[PDB]
């Protein structure tokens, strides 16, 4: 969150860079699918490790997979199937920005998830 | 064999254990971005301003 109090690039980027962890949680937001947005009443939600998302920008547009990992400090997610093959030949996962993906299936093992997404 | 008190010897010990290189794992963690250190010194140079 950064209000129109400060329209200065220095203050916006400082706020993003020194955002606390509870604010970096909100940086993991991604667009919900049409069904999910209709059945939740919100347009976006935070990507969580486990739920299925479709990558819609980058080299891996259209791939659906489960979030393997989430780094809040990096602001990145790790999705099943989104990998870079390294000079060894072994496959490392390529971190993605959550704004480049779209949630298609939500993980609902946590009862707090509904109010987490909205309200 | 100059004679130090407890605090003087403690401060000399602190200086001695400060006089160490940055850990290799620290260098790896910082990606060769923290390799240097301001408290490196040699014993036969400008002495400590500690004692």
């Amino acid at each position: 969150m950064i209000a129109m109090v400060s329209k200065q690039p220095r203050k916006q980027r400082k706020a993003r860079y020194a955002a606390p962890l509870h604010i970096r949680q909100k940086f993991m937001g991604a667009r919900l699918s049409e069904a999910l947005t209709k059945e939740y009443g919100t347009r976006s939600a935070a990507v969580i490790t486990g739920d299925t998302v479709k990558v819609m920008r980058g080299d891996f547009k259209g791939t659906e997979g489960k979030v393997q990992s989430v780094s809040l400090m990096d602001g990145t997610i790790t999705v099943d199937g989104v990998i870079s093959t390294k000079v060894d030949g072994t496959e490392v996962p390529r971190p993605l920005n959550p704004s480049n993906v779209m949630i298609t299936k939500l993980e609902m093992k946590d009862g707090r998830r509904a109010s987490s997404i909205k309200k | 064999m100059s004679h130090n008190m407890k605090g003087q010897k403690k401060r000399l010990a602190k200086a001695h254990k400060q006089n160490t290189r940055v850990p290799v794992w620290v260098i790896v963690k910082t990606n060769r971005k923290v390799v240097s250190h301001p408290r490196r010194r040699h014993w036969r140079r400008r002495s400590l301003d500690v004692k």
Partner: protein
């Protein structure tokens, strides 16, 4: 406030076990009386004497000579040294 930090396990410190002495890193604030009483409370062994030095790491080392034979070995086994 316990004066004893932990048993000190180096070659010279392990050489004490064969003469029934045991070496500890202790709080530098504490003195020989406090170290003796705290060790006696900690392990239930009567301490015959305490020798103490200060190191260039800023630590204090204490070699404890016990009165009961095998007390050093038994404390080392209780801690997990032996």
């Amino acid at each position: 406030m316990s004066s004893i930090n932990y048993p000190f396990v180096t070659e010279k410190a392990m050489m004490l076990l064969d003469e029934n002495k045991l070496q500890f890193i202790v709080d530098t604030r504490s003195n020989k009386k406090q170290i003796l009483e705290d060790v006696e409370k900690m392990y239930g062994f009567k301490v015959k004497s305490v020798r103490t030095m200060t190191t260039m790491k800023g630590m204090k080392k204490a070699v404890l000579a016990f009165e009961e034979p095998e007390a050093a070995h038994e404390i080392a086994t209780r801690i997990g040294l032996m």
